[PDB]
Scaffold this active site. Structure first.
Site, PDB file in Angstrom:
ATOM      1  N   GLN B  77       0.790  -1.241   0.000  1.00  0.00           N
ATOM      2  CA  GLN B  77       0.000   0.000   0.000  1.00  0.00           C
ATOM      3  C   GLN B  77       0.822   1.291   0.000  1.00  0.00           C
ATOM      4  O   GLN B  77       0.310   2.363   0.335  1.00  0.00           O
ATOM      5  CB  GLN B  77      -1.041  -0.013   1.127  1.00  0.00           C
ATOM      6  CG  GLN B  77      -2.206  -0.959   0.847  1.00  0.00           C
ATOM      7  CD  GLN B  77      -2.935  -0.645  -0.457  1.00  0.00           C
ATOM      8  OE1 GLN B  77      -3.057   0.519  -0.852  1.00  0.00           O
ATOM      9  NE2 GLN B  77      -3.434  -1.682  -1.121  1.00  0.00           N
ATOM     10  N   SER B  78       2.084   1.182  -0.400  1.00  0.00           N
ATOM     11  CA  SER B  78       3.008   2.314  -0.447  1.00  0.00           C
ATOM     12  C   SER B  78       2.538   3.428  -1.388  1.00  0.00           C
ATOM     13  O   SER B  78       2.196   3.173  -2.539  1.00  0.00           O
ATOM     14  CB  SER B  78       4.387   1.827  -0.893  1.00  0.00           C
ATOM     15  OG  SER B  78       5.193   2.907  -1.328  1.00  0.00           O
ATOM     16  N   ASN B  79       2.526   4.656  -0.887  1.00  0.00           N
ATOM     17  CA  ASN B  79       2.210   5.819  -1.718  1.00  0.00           C
ATOM     18  C   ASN B  79       3.372   6.152  -2.628  1.00  0.00           C
ATOM     19  O   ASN B  79       3.172   6.580  -3.759  1.00  0.00           O
ATOM     20  CB  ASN B  79       1.882   7.031  -0.858  1.00  0.00           C
ATOM     21  CG  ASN B  79       0.759   6.764   0.113  1.00  0.00           C
ATOM     22  OD1 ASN B  79      -0.379   6.514  -0.288  1.00  0.00           O
ATOM     23  ND2 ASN B  79       1.069   6.821   1.400  1.00  0.00           N
ATOM     24  N   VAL B  81       5.506   4.046  -4.058  1.00  0.00           N
ATOM     25  CA  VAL B  81       5.493   3.153  -5.214  1.00  0.00           C
ATOM     26  C   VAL B  81       4.454   3.637  -6.241  1.00  0.00           C
ATOM     27  O   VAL B  81       4.766   3.742  -7.439  1.00  0.00           O
ATOM     28  CB  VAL B  81       5.287   1.674  -4.798  1.00  0.00           C
ATOM     29  CG1 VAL B  81       5.254   0.758  -6.013  1.00  0.00           C
ATOM     30  CG2 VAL B  81       6.399   1.222  -3.851  1.00  0.00           C
TER      31      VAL B  81
END
Lengths: 324, 328
Positions: B77-79, B81
């Site tokens: 759920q990385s912003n 990435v």
């Protein structure tokens, strides 16, 4: 213009970007530009915010303490209205329908609907918005009887007043394009406020450009009257005349409002992968699919540059996943 | 003047105008203190965020190097990435992402919705791993495979937090000083402190432009003892790159992230609900909701230097709301 008569709140501030899309342009073999009205500062943005600048200003002048509106469970308009109410310390009541008869959990509880809960929206469910204006009046009377001062915003925020937001958008478009070929403009046409507002604005500012509304809920026959009616109402209230014909394409929304289709989803995928731009399955993806097929079918008036109006909608991506 | 060496770094234009700096009258009324907000959550690219300021510098560096592929790492759920992938799509660069599940969830919305959903829209090549135990080493190993295919990869560390990435937040400090000039006298600034590039870039910028202002990092993944050296290393590296010194002490509060990175907590959730309901502003359960929870408790317990205005840096994160719903 001389349209600065109407009181308005400043929700947007700076003009939204107008950008060249060099990768899509290269792929389509045509110059494509985009008006980024999906990039506004309030609660993930969208076109409805431009409308609410006028509608909520009117609400305040009337001393309202509650905003009431209606839409689908995943309505972008309802979410934007709820966020504005929150910001301003106003109550919000939303009359919601399930226009597609889905029981899919993400449609029911995620995306725009999740945000409603965060904004403390009072939710009223109904079987069908068969008479929106009437149903909104009944709710408003009930809420008023509870001790609040409600203000009714129509579905889509599409009154002549709400549509002023898009007359304003045209001014931004006019100045942003004065250095561009220009030939055509494409926008999703639903409740019709955006289409009509741009119609009036563009007639007076860029008369050489063709405006095409890609319908998201109705045939050309059901939609044209709505759009003309609003166009003339806006025109009168600005002491202008509007003589331009309304252009609509209704080929791109089957099998109905709020139901994704393949061309629509493929338009979403294309814009995302070529340009890093996010469309939506209900509105902008279908409108874009209309633009692309326009190039396929040589449907525009000539082969010159095209401007797509990005009206927003992307939070619906999370509601429609994985399926409805 | 002191920050003029910034001009030396090539940079792309992803943001455009300075992002808004807004007063929060309803939140301020509730908390009993003037709260302002720096809206780095409102950017034109794929739902915005702080990571976009870092990418302006990083991707310019990639282009200068003749790279055709961006490689990075993060949580599912990385912003970071998601913003890296969006930028790669926009520029016609390939993108490879090494992803981990930091919380061991089997929730389908966490696994497939939110930021992760957007990754597929950007044609990101996804490489799963059991855990980012050594991100720099694992990124390198992946870059070697990618290079063997003939691609020309540019490795971006977790969060985009290198000294160069961090120049984006040195730049943001310049905006903040300009926007506050004559309009408000800030006492404090609050930002989530993760991979540490945002905190560090602000620390350097604010030390030189607004030295009286107290900058507080609220940790989202680590204790003060683990986090502080990471922030200091970047702070010093940034300063060196700009021919400046940086003598400011770094401040961090670590009371607001438990039980750990990417796990929601009650005070985080209540901060999200408060900002949404009072201001129509969307925070997130991983970063900003936790940082805001820290700001709020800091006021309650009188942790700040004085009683004056606080600026919250909204670093973004909202697309995660949809991935964490209904639960993880």
């Amino acid at each position: 213009h001389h349209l600065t008569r109407f009181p308005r709140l400043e929700f947007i501030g700076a003009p939204t970007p107008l950008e060249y899309l060099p990768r899509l342009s290269d792929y389509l073999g045509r110059e494509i530009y985009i008006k980024r009205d999906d990039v506004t500062p309030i609660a993930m943005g969208g076109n409805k915010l431009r409308k609410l600048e006028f509608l909520v200003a009117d609400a305040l002048r009337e001393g309202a303490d509650t905003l009431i509106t209606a839409g689908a469970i995943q309505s972008n308009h309802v979410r934007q209205t709820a966020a504005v109410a929150a910001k301003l310390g106003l109550h919000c009541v939303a009359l919601l329908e399930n226009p597609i008869g889905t029981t899919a959990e993400n449609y029911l509880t995620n995306g725009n609907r999740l945000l409603l809960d965060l904004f403390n929206t009072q939710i009223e469910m109904c079987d069908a918005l068969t008479d929106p204006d009437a149903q909104l009046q009944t709710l408003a009377t009930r809420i008023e009887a509870q001790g609040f001062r409600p203000y009714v915003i129509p579905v889509g925020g599409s009154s002549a007043l709400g549509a002023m937001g898009y007359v304003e958008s045209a001014l931004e478009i006019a100045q942003q394009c004065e250095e561009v070929g220009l030939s055509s403009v494409v926008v999703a046409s639903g409740s019709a406020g955006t289409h009509a507002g741009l119609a009036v604005g563009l007639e007076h500012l860029m008369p050489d450009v063709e405006l095409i509304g890609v319908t998201v809920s109705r045939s050309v026959a059901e939609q044209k009257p709505k759009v003309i009616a609003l166009q003339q109402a806006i025109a009168g209230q600005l002491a202008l005349t509007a003589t331009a014909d309304i252009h609509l394409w209704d080929d791109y929304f089957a099998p109905g409002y709020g139901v994704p289709n393949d061309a629509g989803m493929e338009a979403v995928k294309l814009l995302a992968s070529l340009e890093g731009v996010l469309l939506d399955p209900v509105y902008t993806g279908k409108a874009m699919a209309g633009l692309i097929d326009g190039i396929s079918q040589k449907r525009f008036n000539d082969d010159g540059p095209i401007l797509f109006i990005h009206t927003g909608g992307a939070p619906a991506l999370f509601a429609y996943h994985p399926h409805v």
